[PDB]
Every structure is written in C-alpha cells, then in structure tokens.
Amino acid sequence: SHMPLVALLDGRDCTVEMPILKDVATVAFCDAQSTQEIHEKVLNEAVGALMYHTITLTREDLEKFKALRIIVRIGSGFDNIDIKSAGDLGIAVCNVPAVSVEETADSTLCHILNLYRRATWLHQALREGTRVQSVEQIREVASGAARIRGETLGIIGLGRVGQAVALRAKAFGFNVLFYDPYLSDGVERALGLQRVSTLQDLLFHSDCVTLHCGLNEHNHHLINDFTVKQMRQGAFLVNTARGGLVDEKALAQALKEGRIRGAALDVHESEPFSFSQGPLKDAPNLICTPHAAWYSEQASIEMREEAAREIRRAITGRIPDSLKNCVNKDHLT
Amino acid sequence: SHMPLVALLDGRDCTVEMPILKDVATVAFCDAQSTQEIHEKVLNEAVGALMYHTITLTREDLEKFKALRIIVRIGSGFDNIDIKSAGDLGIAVCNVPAVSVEETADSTLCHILNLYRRATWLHQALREGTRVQSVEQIREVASGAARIRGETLGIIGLGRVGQAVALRAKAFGFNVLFYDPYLSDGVERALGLQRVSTLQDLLFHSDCVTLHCGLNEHNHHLINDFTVKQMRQGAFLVNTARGGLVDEKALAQALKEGRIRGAALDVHESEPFSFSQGPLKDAPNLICTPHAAWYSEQASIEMREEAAREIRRAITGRIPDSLKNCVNKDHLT
Amino acid sequence: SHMPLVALLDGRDCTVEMPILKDVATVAFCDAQSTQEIHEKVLNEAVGALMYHTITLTREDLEKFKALRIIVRIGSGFDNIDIKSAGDLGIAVCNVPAVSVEETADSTLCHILNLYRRATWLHQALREGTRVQSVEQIREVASGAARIRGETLGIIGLGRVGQAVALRAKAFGFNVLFYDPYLSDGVERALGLQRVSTLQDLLFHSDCVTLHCGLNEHNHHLINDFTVKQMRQGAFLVNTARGGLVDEKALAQALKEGRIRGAALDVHESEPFSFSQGPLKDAPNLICTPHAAWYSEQASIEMREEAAREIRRAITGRIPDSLKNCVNKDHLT
Amino acid sequence: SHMPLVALLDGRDCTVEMPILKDVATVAFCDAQSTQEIHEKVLNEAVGALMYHTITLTREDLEKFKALRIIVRIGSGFDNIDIKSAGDLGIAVCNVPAVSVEETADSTLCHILNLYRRATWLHQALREGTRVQSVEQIREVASGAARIRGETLGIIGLGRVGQAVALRAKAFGFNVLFYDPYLSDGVERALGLQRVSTLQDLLFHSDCVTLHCGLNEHNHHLINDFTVKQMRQGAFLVNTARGGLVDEKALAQALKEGRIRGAALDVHESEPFSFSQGPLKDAPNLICTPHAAWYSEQASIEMREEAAREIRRAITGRIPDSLKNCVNKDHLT
Ligand SMILES: NC(=O)C1=CN([C@@H]2O[C@H](COP(=O)(O)OP(=O)(O)OC[C@H]3O[C@@H](n4cnc5c(N)ncnc54)[C@H](O)[C@@H]3O)[C@@H](O)[C@H]2O)C=CC1
Ligand SMILES: NC(=O)C1=CN([C@@H]2O[C@H](COP(=O)(O)OP(=O)(O)OC[C@H]3O[C@@H](n4cnc5c(N)ncnc54)[C@H](O)[C@@H]3O)[C@@H](O)[C@H]2O)C=CC1
Ligand SMILES: NC(=O)C1=CN([C@@H]2O[C@H](COP(=O)(O)OP(=O)(O)OC[C@H]3O[C@@H](n4cnc5c(N)ncnc54)[C@H](O)[C@@H]3O)[C@@H](O)[C@H]2O)C=CC1
Ligand SMILES: NC(=O)C1=CN([C@@H]2O[C@H](COP(=O)(O)OP(=O)(O)OC[C@H]3O[C@@H](n4cnc5c(N)ncnc54)[C@H](O)[C@@H]3O)[C@@H](O)[C@H]2O)C=CC1
Ligand SMILES: [Cl-]
Ligand SMILES: [Cl-]
Ligand SMILES: [Cl-]
Ligand SMILES: [Cl-]
Ligand SMILES: [Cl-]
Ligand SMILES: [Cl-]
Ligand SMILES: [Cl-]
Ligand SMILES: [Cl-]
C-alpha cells in the first residue's frame, strides 16, 4: 500500500503531472532553490525527482539522496546536473529535448530582428517621450538599423534549435554559416548551409553570432576576452542557449567600446537577471529576457506531461532500458 | 544660365541628391510640415518637388504652385498627395516603390514575433525591476506568449511587402491567408498561399492580422468598430502600412476589453505618435514604433538616389514618357 | 423555349460542362481541327464557343460567325485567337488562367531535372540494351549529368508559372535570374530573385534557360539564330510555354553543333509533334512531350468547370461586366 | 625505398588519385568484379584498398588478404563489405559520405516527378510514334499523371539524402512524412516534418514512398510481399538507396496487378540491371536507371580525392585515430 516518492525540487505546481502519476507515485514539492531547502524526508525517501533549471545538483548535493534512482529535467538542458557523478551513484538522468525547439527558434529570430530592426529600442524611445516628427529624426532615433539581406548569420551549435534557426534565417536573406565540431561531415549539404571548422572562422565571417550549443565542460566562457576580439567590428551577439557560455565581463566592455553593436540575451551567468546588478549593469545596446525563450502554454504542458511519463516508465519498468531520453546511460552503473 | 528650381519640401538634408542634380537643377529645401511654411519663391518658381510622408498636399495646396511640373515621393506610399487633382493641374506624381520592401517585411516579422514571443514586453518588465526567479514566475511574466506553428496569419494586401511577409511567415509554420480584391485569380497558386474573397473571411479565420495595403479612397478605417468585431477573440493586429487604415478609437476599446490581445503599430492616424496623447493613451498590450519600418542606411540612400534620378529624367526628358514610376499617368493632362 | 447554342469547337467530350449549362444553353461539339470543319448551323447560330489550343481563329475565321458573342479558352494561353479582331467584331474572349499553374511548374522542373540528371536518357539506354556494369561505364553512359547547385536558371516571363518555377528551383540550389520587361520594379525583391533588363543579359548569364511567357506579337521566334548565339556554350533550353517562341531551325543546328547540350520541349511550332518530321527530325539530346505539362485529372476537370461557368455568366449576364477572366475588354466594342 | 601497395579493386582508372598518393603508396588496379579476379600479389602485399560498389567482400574474401590494413569505399554505402569481420581481422573500413548527397536528392526528385508527370513515358510514346493531336488524346496518353500538391511523400530513412529530399519535396506542395527508428525525437521539429513510429504507418499514409536508408542486417527486403500490402492502392515507389531493400518478386506482381501504379529504381537486387532478365522483365509502369543517382563530373572527382586522402592518412598516421570517416571503429581490434 506504500508507493514510491517523487519530488518536484525547484517548483511547487504539480497539477499537470498528477493525472499521469496518481496510481504510481506519491508526489510532493519542495519549491527549493538549493539542496539546503529540501526536506529531510525527500532526501531519504525520494526515488524519483523532477526539476527545472533553477537548482544545481553537484556530487555533494547528489550524495545527500539515499534512495533516488532517476532525475528528469523538465526541459532539454541538463548542464545544471553533475551527470557523470549521477551515473556513478546509480542515478539515471533524463531530459525533454523536443518540446520547446520551435518556441526557442522563434524567440531567437525575434531577438535577431530586434537588433537589426531596433523595434524594442524604438518602442522604449517612444515610452521615454522621444518625439520623432521629421525623417531626419527617424533616421537618428533608428540609427544602427541595418539591411538583413547579404548579412552573415553565424550559428554555434547546429542541433535541434540551430537547424530551426538556420531555416528561418534563410527566409530573410541571411547567409548562414555554422560551427559544430561534433557533427559528421555532410549535414551542411542536406540543409544547404556553409560550414566552418573552427570558432575563429565562425566569428571572423559572421555579422551576427547566435549561440545554440549545450553548456558542457569544454565551452564555458566560449565567448571570452580572447574570442570576443575575433568577432567582426560592430557585430551582433544573441544567446538563447546558456549564460555560462559568455564572459559577461568581456561582453560589457565590448558593448561599451562599440566593438559589439548590440546583444540580446535570454540567459545569463547568474539568473535571475537584473539590470541593476552584474557585469552588465551599465552595458549599452543590451536587450534581455528572463529565460523565457522556451515558454508557450502548449510547450509548458507538453514537457511536464513527457517528464511525468518518463518518471512513470522508470518506476514501472527497468532502468535505463525503459527510458526514452536518458542522457547518461554511459555513466550509469 | 538659369536652371530649374527643385525643392525638398518636408526635409532639409539634400546631400545625397546634390551629385545627381548639380548640373541640372538648383536645389533648395523648405523643412516644412505644411504648405503654410513654404517660401513664396518656391511656390512660384519650383518646377520639381521632393517630399517624404510628413506633409500633405491637397488640391488647395497644389493650386498654390504656379510652375510645378513633377512631384517625387521619396518612398512607396503616395496617399499624402491628391493624385487626381495633381494630374488635373498637369503635375506628374512619382514614387520609389522597391527600395524598402524587405526592410518593411523584416520590421513586420519583428513586430509579429514581438507579440507572439513578448520579447519587447519581457525586456520592459526587466527594466521595470520585475524579478523572475522561479518557473512559475517565468510563466506569469510571459503569460500570453503562444506557439506559432498552426496559427493563421492573415495578410491584407498581397503586394511587394505582403508577398515578402508571406514567404517569411511560412518559415515559422504560419498558415498564410491573404485578402486582396484587386489581384487576378492565380497569384495564390504561384506562391502556394490560400486566398479569401472578403475582408470578413480574412478576419474570421486569422489569429494574427497584418496590414500591407496602400491607403486609398475605399479603405480608410478599414479596421473599424464594425470590422473589429469580425476578428477572432484574442487575435493580434500589426500595421506597418498606413495609420489611416485603423480606427484607433475602436482599437483602443478592443485592447482594453481583451477582444484583441495585442497590437504592434509602426504608423498612426496622427503622426508623430505619443503614448501621452491620442485614442491609444491608455491602451494596454500596445507596441509602437515611429514610422521606422522602412529605414536602413542603404535603403535611405538608395531611395533618395532613385528619387533624384526621377527628377532629372523629368527635367531632362518628356513627361510622363521618361518617368519610370509615375503613378498618375491616367490623370495627367 | 429556344435556348442559345454553345459549341465545343476542337473537342467532342462535353460531359463535364453539361451539368453547369443544361438549363442555360444547347451544347454541341464539332471535333474540328480548322474552321473548315465546323457545321454551318454552328457558324450561323452559335452564341458561345468553347475551344482548347488545337484550332486557330483568324479574323477570316472569326468573320464566319454571325451570332457568336463570347469565346472561352479552356486554358490560359489565347495566342491561337485573333484577340483584337475578336473585339472589333464584338466578341468577348476569356481564358482559364489559374488551374494548371502548378502542374506546369512541376512538369518544367521534371524536364529541368531530366536534363541535369539524364534520367529519361538513362532509361532509354537501358531499354536499348546498354550494359552498365563498371563505374567507368556509369560515368560514360551518364556523361553530361551535372551538379545543380551553383548553376544559374534563367526564367523568361515571371508570371504565374514563372514564379512557381522560381520557388521550386531555389530548393535545388539554383541561382535564379529572370527577364520580364512588362513588370514594374520591385517584384524581384518580394521573391528574393535577381532581375535583368534585357534578353541578352538573361541568356548570357544562364546555364539553363526556361521559357514561361505568353506568345504575343513581339516575341515570335524570341529564340532565333541570333539570340541562340547569345546563350552560354553547353547550356540547356526548356520550353513549356509556346512553340512559336523558338526557331526550331536554329535550335536543331545548335544541338547538332553542341552549342546547346540539351533541350526539353513540351510545345512545338507545329503540333502534334513527331520525331520523324520537322526541323528537329535528327536533333540530338532532345526530350519532347506532347503538350501535356498542364494535365492532371483534377486540373482537366477544374478548368472545364470554370470555362462552363464563364459561358453561363456571359449568357446570363452582361458582357463584359459579368466576366471574370475576359482578356480583351480593351478591344471590345 | 619500398612503398606500401594500394589497389583499386573494382576499377581501372587511378588518374585522380595518383597526385595525392604518388610519394606515399604504389598504386595498382585490378578491374575485378569478384575476389577471384585479384592478382595474388595484391592479396599478399596490398596494405590499402580502394573500391566502389560493384564487388562484394565477405569474411571469406577478407581472409585472403594478408597485409591489408584499410579499405576505403569511394562512396557512402558500405553494405557490400562485411564490416564486422573486417574489424575482427584488424581492417579499418571507411566511406565518403558527403560528396553525392545533393546529386542523389536531385535524382530522386527527378524520378518522383517522372512518375507524377510521366515525362519519361510521354517521351517514349513519342519515340514509339504515338500521335497526340486532340486534347482527348493528350488526356489518354498522359493518363495517370496526378496533381502533386496535397499528396503525401513518405521517406524511409531521414539521413543526409532523406533530409535533402524532404526540403525539395516541400517546395512542390508535398506533405512529407518520414520513418526512421534510429533517430532521437526532435529532428522532425527542426525541419518541420511529421514523423511516424512504424513502417506500417509510413506506408499506410503515403501516396509516394521513397527509400533513403542504408542496407543493414535488419532491413533486407524491407519492401516485401507483406509490407507491399500495407501500401496505398495506386501508390508510387522510388528507390535510389539500395536494391537489397526491395523484393523485386513482390514488386513485379504489384505493378502487374496495379496495386502500385509505378516505380522508379536506380538500384536493383542484382546489378547491372537489364529489362530482359530478372523478376522485373515484364513489369509495367517501370522506370530504371543504372545506379547513376550519385554521378556528376564534380562529385566523381571530389569523392575520389577524399578517398585518396583517407588512404594517405591511414598509411601516414595511426589507424583509426587519423581517419575522418571510419565506420567500424567499434569492431576494430
Ligand atoms: N529558454 C531557453 O533559453 C532555452 C535554451 N535552450 C538551450 O539551447 C541549447 C541548444 O539546445 P538544443 O539545440 O535542443 O540542443 P541539441 O543537443 O539539439 O544541440 C546542441 C548542439 O550544440 C553542439 N555543440 C556543443 N558544444 C559545442 C561547441 N563548443 N561549439 C559548437 N557547437 C557545439 C552539439 O554538437 C549539438 O549539435 C541548449 O544549451 C539548451 O539548454 C533550449 C531551449 C530553451
Ligand atoms: N515605414 C513604413 O511604415 C512603410 C510602409 N509602407 C506601406 O505599406 C503599404 C504596402 O506597400 P507595398 O506592398 O509596397 O505596396 P504595393 O502597391 O506593392 O501593394 C499594395 C497592395 O495592397 C492591395 N490593396 C489595396 N487596397 C486594399 C484593400 N482595401 N484590401 C486588401 N488589399 C488592398 C493592392 O491590391 C496591392 O496589391 C503601403 O501603404 C506603403 O505606404 C511601405 C514601406 C514602409
Ligand atoms: N501545357 C503547356 O504547355 C502549358 C503552357 N502554358 C503556357 O505558359 C505560358 C505562361 O503562362 P502563365 O505564367 O500562366 O502566363 P502569365 O500571364 O501568368 O505570365 C506571362 C508572363 O510572361 C511575360 N512576358 C511576355 N512576353 C515576354 C517577353 N517577350 N519576354 C519576357 N517576358 C515576357 C509577361 O510579362 C507575364 O508576366 C503561357 O504562354 C501559357 O500558354 C501554360 C500552362 C500549360
Ligand atoms: N547512386 C545511388 O543510388 C546512391 C545511393 N545512396 C544510398 O542511399 C542511402 C542513404 O544514404 P545517406 O542518406 O547518405 O545515408 P545516411 O547514413 O546519411 O542516412 C541513412 C539513414 O537511414 C536510416 N535507416 C536505416 N535503416 C532504416 C530502416 N530499416 N528504416 C528506416 N530508416 C532507416 C538511418 O537511421 C539513417 O538516418 C544509402 O544506402 C546509400 O548507399 C547514396 C548515394 C548515391
Ligand atoms: Cl532551458
Ligand atoms: Cl566563406
Ligand atoms: Cl512609408
Ligand atoms: Cl480556410
Ligand atoms: Cl496550354
Ligand atoms: Cl549577375
Ligand atoms: Cl552508391
Ligand atoms: Cl497523419
């Protein structure tokens, strides 16, 4: 009569998951931002866990769990989990990779166009009371807005979202390059894209750089004081991937010195983001959104339902064989 | 030794046009907002005129010119000129129809995505100090953001910009309908679009309505208290065409009552626009830009050079035969 | 109790049209190839006429009709009718312009690919008993097959079919140019195409030329001994438009001398076509189809139903106001 | 002063490879169709081997080599090599996966259109002397030609060529489904395609089935007497992948009984192909090409140069680390 315990770590709403797990697991929530806020009962008895991106699990955090057997990220990115240590400790880790692909690609294109077209900045100027009566004043307030056709969009990471961005970018006349050192040769041919071998080549030829790679152990601060200097003078930077990929120190100085004309960021090294704190406090030509590229009403539901099914498959079946999106089978023993 | 006089009515900068007209016409500027601000010398002696969109010419205004023989709009729209009366008075009217086509289509897609993705509103909330730490808070602050695929984009006016928008919209998964009662049947087939016969059908099936038609004598307040009721509950409205097409009274009430979830406007019934005056003073979910959809550094130059060449062709050749983009040959006698 | 007479000139099957015209007109057929084969009753009493492309009507032919008031081409092209003389004689002429647009564009792409890929010629070689065992033999039998990406496709006439071809050609990596001296500037921008001003420029830069213009009084033998010399050495020629546009004499010599590597023709100066007669008797690298680019089971029905409705509208309403696709309103008096 | 020996097994021309291997290896050719035709010197001393698709290497064949250390397929498919046994024997196997991707996709679209549009069959009828004078005769000779828009194209194997086909098929109005049980979920979203879970679903919903998967140990005769019955009545079949995927027995009967309206085959169970032998001797509505989907003058050179470089990398460096496209690293010991 005793069911396994499943805990929603960094959240409180479990409404979507309940119908799928009702007869399978007892569902509790922690609404926690760190391991220090998880009730002892959870650490001891929790067999499964659901979590988003607002809490990190190190080996130290993972070792506090005594019965945990699966973690499911409600989302694609799993950089916030020590995946290797989870496998060493016998904990399967899964993600939801497909739900918000096109939502994120559309958010990225929105930011790209918001830089080339300055719509968001033009709206601000009107909210601030700027009066734009003459054509000379239109040119002035819209200074920086550039023609898109002929421009080169450089994609770092041509996975699910990267490919979706590439196909959308082609519709506007962008010349699309991409850098992805983990794919085999020939993917550029199917999608009619141009490929480059190094990060330096990508930054050197791109008028607008957009990040679409996972954050792994080999690309933290991929955009740093060194690689920022490899970018075109007056280029754009867009990041809907992970904030850990950009050295905000180097980015702030680049915006201030005009080496980078503008930047649009949905993610940041330290989240939540605030224009009153951080290395970007006074950075100009900066657009930001609070890690919302993924969100739609349908997507939010679809990924929670998928994550709930993965939990069910783990409790009901054999780990890791019954799992559809386990991302650490190699490390699991 | 006496050259014809050409006047830039509603502007002052003539730098781009001078190299093309130096040996052909004397160039002066008026920097005028109305006919009342034009120097008497211009009204009497001006043979040609260059003007943007910030000044209107009625028959009353046109009759004040005693030597004018051609007007060239530096831009595509010529609704601000009494075209028929200009032809009656023997004045050719020309425009520049091709320069800013893709700039405007990209601005339109930016506004479309800014509504579906709420990037501009999410940026404001961060500037306003909103703190978005939990996923529940992300869902809250981004409430209204919707998935694009499957949504129906309704285009009113499938000309140069409309077709450019249609092709871009298809890349995001939009289902594209269009209404244009002046085209012959078969244009929908070449571009693979669906066509509807009436404005009511367009508004009835569209989740997002975008205007791309010229303002003529048969579509002022095309979007009015009556036709607004024919739109889907919670639909979007985008207008980069002409402000005279929308009854801002009806639009304000629709936004306030939630019948329309959001609106993005680059043009307005009375320009320049201000959030502190007009029927849209307190309208919610409203994005606005100061008639800047056309602008790029290249476009601004290209259209001024084309307009200068048209002037030259008129002074040097025979009106209207030597004109490339005369829009009132039928009325000219 | 007496109904008007409507005659299907160059056909016999009236099954599709009968349900639409039953209570409106008496329907007869002539199954005629020339005016000389039309029964006297038809010439005297026929008020309306339906015809395809296999019969020509000169002023001499038109003058033989004493009551005819409308002609409806079951199809888009109306070059086979003296349109001006028909208007002088008070005869409205209409067409069906939209039905087979995409069928024809798909046929054109089939011919284009059949030249670049030599599928049809490779099939023939297998039917002829050629044995292709080694790679060296594959290269030999497929000699001439070329990579498409980077190649330039030159479109002459960017109307309904031309635009449909252009959009399909872009999917294969073609660089698309077009020549159309009757369109206004700016259509190239909406569809992202490159435009040229003269026929010579089109032929000079194109690796594959495809015709998509109507046959009018200013382009008979548009491809002639002179303009053929303006084409690239080893270029392709495709014609799904009208045979009168090509001088088959010049074309045969070009194929024989290798100036043109191959040609695909759905239409010919004299139809029906036969490989045993005509200037193309012994021309090599020649593909031909019997004027079938338009045909699909749905298209054949759709255009006959549309043509029947046009007839009905003419008999029931006022000519030319009630007509949807009258192509000679200017000449009608 | 003694260099390693490299042999071109099933070919004779080594001109392209010589400049790359001149100072690295002695190059000989065998022009062999089977292992029985290879000179004893080659079997004993050959360190590297180059081969196309016209010779098969079993474990029995592989065991005859006493010094062979790498095989390089000049092409993508390596089904003609016992890959596992090659690894057991310490032989690295490599391929050239990217060269002819778009050539093959264009050949596939040519065959697809040749079925829907019957261009190749219409050309034959003209070569055979068929006279097509009336529209009724055009409909007759072109019977079977169908409208493409709305039709469903089912892709089996969405790799390099499959994705290239999918993007081209979308330009014609196809609804594209694909079946590929080896990809992870989410690839359909990036390319905007619909995905199905089983082969039966693919065949059940597809009007035209096109094969684009490698031939492996789990899909020989994937199209068989059983799965052919799961296809739509009157559907099309296209195969530019491998002939071993189709049971030509079942295919012949399907074409004869009309269950399949037509088939286009670039590959066959037994190659070379002949219309006078095999289960397809008398099959109707059959188009065939002699395994030429890959060929272009540029592609033929590019893959031979890549294959030569792979050989060089193997002789010069460390196997398998220095290899770019080794397809049997797992089996190599
Ligand atoms: N709201 C948001 O901000 C959202 C963010 N994301 C993030 O976007 C990123 C991409 O997601 P997906 O495309 O679904 O992942 P994916 O796994 O489909 O694609 C990742 C690609 O990046 C490439 N890559 C990895 N390291 C690289 C490097 N150093 N340089 C170049 N390429 C590299 C990989 O080869 C792979 O192809 C993820 O980090 C994910 O967390 C995803 C959805 C929403
Ligand atoms: N910065 C800005 O806000 C810019 C605004 N525009 C405006 O956008 C509009 C479109 O420009 P283009 O596409 O270049 O013009 P266009 O002449 O190429 O296309 C206009 C189309 O609208 C159609 N139309 C007219 N009245 C209509 C009605 N009542 N209902 C439906 N369709 C109707 C016409 O048939 C025509 O096809 C113009 O009014 C122009 O002034 C253009 C460029 C920049
Ligand atoms: N089975 C077949 O072979 C079929 C043939 N056709 C033919 O294809 C042709 C095109 O049809 P649509 O695109 O529907 O006609 P359309 O009227 O939509 O387009 C014709 C275009 O050709 C252009 N043009 C005319 N003369 C020209 C010249 N000398 N140089 C360059 N451009 C020129 C016009 O400006 C116009 O834009 C027609 O002649 C039609 O008869 C159409 C359908 C089926
Ligand atoms: N001249 C010719 O006929 C040419 C033939 N080919 C052939 O085309 C085929 C595809 O080549 P690429 O796309 O480059 O290979 P690829 O490795 O890029 O793609 C193969 C795809 O097929 C899928 N697949 C394998 N077995 C399957 C099954 N039973 N059901 C559904 N999907 C399955 C795999 O998951 C993979 O995604 C190969 O067999 C190759 O030999 C390639 C080039 C020229
Ligand atoms: Cl995320
Ligand atoms: Cl480059
Ligand atoms: Cl404007
Ligand atoms: Cl509908
Ligand atoms: Cl026709
Ligand atoms: Cl050029
Ligand atoms: Cl192959
Ligand atoms: Cl389905």
Q: Are D308 and D16 in contact (CB under 8 A)?
A: yes
| B184 in contact with chain C, both atoms CB, cutoff 8 A | yes
Joined tokens for residue B173: 């998964």
Same domain, D60 and D172: no
- What DSSP character marks residue C2? P
CATH of the domain at B279: 3.40.50.720
Asked if residue D290 has a cis previous peptide bond (ω within 30° of 0), the answer is no
Joined tokens for residue D23: 């100072």
Same domain, B125 and B151: yes
At B35, is the secondary structure helix, strand, or coil? helix
Q: Which residue has the tokens 């046994």?
A: D85
Same domain, C224 and C331: no
Cβ distance C127 to D168 less than 8 Å, yes or no, reads no
Q: Which residue has the tokens 């601005």?
A: B107
Contacts of C173 in chain A (CB under 8 A): 192
Chain length of chain C:
333
Q: Which residue has the tokens 């084409």?
A: C231
Q: Are A238 and A229 in contact (CB under 8 A)?
A: no
For the beta carbon of residue B90, count every other beta carbon within 10 angstroms.
12
Rounded to an integer, what distance in angstroms lies between the CA atom of residue D250 and that of residue C142? Answer: 29
Mention every residue, 6+ apart, whose C-beta is less than 8 A from residue C159. Answer: B190, C180, C212, C213, C214
Burial C227-236 (b: 16+ CB within 10 A, else e): bbeebbeebb
Same domain, D138 and D69: no
Ligand 12 midpoint to CA C204 (Å): 47
Joined tokens for residue C239: 């014609």
- Burial of residue D201 (CB within 10 Å: 0-12, 13-18, 19+) is middle
Rounded to an integer, what distance in angstroms lies between the CA atom of residue D282 and that of residue D112? Answer: 21
- Burial of residue B156 (CB within 10 Å: 0-12, 13-18, 19+) is buried
At C286, is the secondary structure helix, strand, or coil? strand
Are β-strands C92-94 and B92-94 bridged in parallel, bridged antiparallel, or unpaired? unpaired
Element (DSSP H or E) covering residue A264: strand A260-265
* DSSP string across B133-184: -SHHHHHHHTTT----TT-EEEEE--SHHHHHHHHHHHHTTPEEEEE-TTSP
Rounded to an integer, what distance in angstroms lies between the CA atom of residue D106 and that of residue B33? Answer: 58
Interface list for A 73-102 with B (CB within 8 A): 102
Partners of C211 in the β-ladder: C156, C239
- What DSSP character marks residue A280? T
Mention every residue, 6+ apart, whose C-beta is less than 8 A from residue C103. Answer: C293, C294, C295, C296, C299, D147
Q: What is the CA radius of gyration of chain C?
A: 22
Resolution (Å units): 2.4
Mention every residue, 6+ apart, whose C-beta is less than 8 A from residue B193. Answer: B158, B166, B176, B177, B178, B187
For the beta carbon of residue C34, count every other beta carbon within 10 angstroms.
13
Joined tokens for residue C125: 């070689």
Rounded to an integer, what distance in angstroms lies between the CA atom of residue B134 and that of residue D232? Answer: 51
* DSSP string across D11-67: ----TTTHHHHTTT-EEEE---SSGGGS-HHHHHHEEEEEE-SS--B-HHHHHT-SS
* Residue D261, phi then psi, degrees to nearest 5: -75, -30
Joined tokens for residue A217: 């152990």
Nearest 5°: CA angle at A28, between A23 and A29? 145
Q: Are D19 and D312 in contact (CB under 8 A)?
A: no
Joined tokens for residue B234: 């919670």
Where is chain D discontinuous (C–N over 2.5 Å), named by the preceding residue? Answer: none
Ligand 5 midpoint to CA A321 (Å): 26
| B300 in contact with chain A, both atoms CB, cutoff 8 A | yes
* Residue D239, phi then psi, degrees to nearest 5: -140, 105
Q: Are C102 and D149 in contact (CB under 8 A)?
A: yes
Rounded to an integer, what distance in angstroms lies between the CA atom of residue C42 and that of residue C21? Answer: 17
Rounded to an integer, what distance in angstroms lies between the CA atom of residue D49 and that of residue D315? Answer: 11
| B242 annotated to bind ligand | yes
Ligand 2 midpoint to CA B76 (Å): 9
Q: Where are the alpha helices (DSSP H) in chain D?
A: 18-21, 40-45, 59-63, 83-88, 101-117, 119-127, 135-141, 160-171, 187-190, 199-205, 225-228, 248-257, 297-316
Nearest Cα to Cα of residue C183 among C170, C197, C169, C167: C197
Contacts of B274 in chain A (CB under 8 A): 126, 129, 131
Looking at chain A, which residue has its C-alpha nearest residue C149?
A: A192
Q: Determine whether the shortest distance from the Cβ of B216 to ligand 2 is under 6 A.
A: yes
Query: One of B242, B261, B268, B313 is an active-site residue; which one?
Result: B242
| Amino acid at the residue A118 | R
Name residues with Cβ closer than 5 Å to ligand 9, which is an ion.
C 75, 77
- Ligand 4 pocket, Cβ-based, cut-off 6 angstroms: D 76-77, 97, 100-101, 104, 156-162, 179-183, 212-216, 219, 222, 240-242, 266-267, 291, 293-294
Same domain, C207 and C146: yes
Are β-strands B260-265 and B235-239 bridged in parallel, bridged antiparallel, or unpaired? parallel
Active site (annotated) includes residue B271: yes
Same domain, A132 and A155: yes
Same domain, D8 and D54: yes
Same domain, A133 and A80: no
Nearest 5°: CA angle at D31, between D26 and D37? 100
Nearest Cα to Cα of residue B290 among B243, B224, B237: B243
CA D241 vs CA B151, C150, D219, D246: distances in Å: 37, 25, 12, 10
Q: Which residue has the tokens 């915006």?
A: A255
Q: Are D73 and D95 in contact (CB under 8 A)?
A: yes
* Residue B137, phi then psi, degrees to nearest 5: -75, -35
Spacing of C-alpha B306 from chain mean position: 19
Active site positions of D, annotated: 242, 271, 291
Same domain, A325 and A205: no
Contacts of D169 in chain B (CB under 8 A): none
Same domain, B164 and B284: yes
Q: Are A154 and A162 in contact (CB under 8 A)?
A: no
Same domain, D69 and D105: no
- Strands (E) located in chain C: 5-8, 26-29, 46-51, 70-73, 92-94, 152-156, 175-179, 194-195, 208-211, 235-239, 260-265, 286-288
Joined tokens for residue B184: 């012959």
| C218 annotated to bind ligand | yes
Chains in contact with D, counting 3 or more C-beta pairs less than 8 Å apart as contact: A, B, C
Could you list the residue range(s) of the whole structural domain that residue A78 is in?
Answer: 1-100+295-333
Q: Are D33 and C133 in contact (CB under 8 A)?
A: yes
Which of C184, C190, C325 comes nearest B163 by C-beta?
C190
Cβ distance C186 to B97 less than 8 Å, yes or no, reads yes
Say how many domains are in chain C: 2
Direct distance between the N- and C-terminal alpha carbons of chain D, in angstroms, rounded to an integer? 30
For the beta carbon of residue C41, count every other beta carbon within 10 angstroms.
11
Q: Which residue has the tokens 């502007």?
A: B11
Joined tokens for residue D179: 């079946």
At C153, is the secondary structure helix, strand, or coil? strand
Residue nearest to atom 8 of ligand 1 (CA): A241
- Strands (E) located in C59-144: 70-73, 92-94
Where is chain C discontinuous (C–N over 2.5 Å), named by the preceding residue? Answer: none
Same domain, C165 and C255: yes
Q: Are D102 and C149 in contact (CB under 8 A)?
A: yes
Mention every residue, 6+ apart, whose C-beta is less than 8 A from residue D304. Answer: D16, D17, D74
Joined tokens for residue D240: 């530019």
Element (DSSP H or E) covering residue A71: strand A70-73
Rounded to an integer, what distance in angstroms lies between the CA atom of residue A305 and that of residue A99? Answer: 10
Rounded to an integer, what distance in angstroms lies between the CA atom of residue D46 and that of residue C104? Answer: 55
Rounded to an integer, what distance in angstroms lies between the CA atom of residue D58 and that of residue D88? Answer: 12
- Burial of residue B246 (CB within 10 Å: 0-12, 13-18, 19+) is buried
| CA distance, residue A327 to nearest chain D CA (Å) | 11
